[PDB]
Amino acid sequence: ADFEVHMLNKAGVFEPASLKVAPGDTVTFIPTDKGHNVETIKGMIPDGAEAFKSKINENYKVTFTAPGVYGVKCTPHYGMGMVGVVQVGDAPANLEAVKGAKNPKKAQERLDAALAALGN
Numbered sequence: 001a002d003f004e005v006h007m008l009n010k011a012g013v014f015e016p017a018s019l020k021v022a023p024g025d026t027v028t029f030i031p032t033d034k035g036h037n038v039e040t041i042k043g044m045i046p047d048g049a050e051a052f053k054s055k056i057n058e059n060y061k062v063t064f065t066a067p068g069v070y071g072v073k074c075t076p077h078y079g080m081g082m083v084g085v086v087q088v089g090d091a092p093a094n095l096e097a098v099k100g101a102k103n104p105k106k107a108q109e110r111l112d113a114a115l116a117a118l119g120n
């Protein structure tokens, strides 16, 4: 299945900010507003996943196959808290590593909230 995640100004937000998908699903990240991208956060993707970083203002499609939680950021707006979470499958095995990851404060508060929203 195919999902969209939009980057929007309300520094902006990922909408949805938390997203659960199954292994093999695809997410397209779409910067509706200018100035945004998506990039994985170091230490916040599961084993077997590849890091990725899209170009500013480009639509970027990722097929998610490795299970676990993925923390993602907009590269320039990371410090302001523009971040999201994609969870692949139902019982993520990397939760300890991701909860241990250091982030800017505002990024941490949003990451924590997105994780909570997904039941973790």
Ligand SMILES: [Cu+2]
Binding pocket: 007, 011, 012, 035, 036, 037, 074, 075, 076, 077, 082
């Ligand atoms: Cu941004």
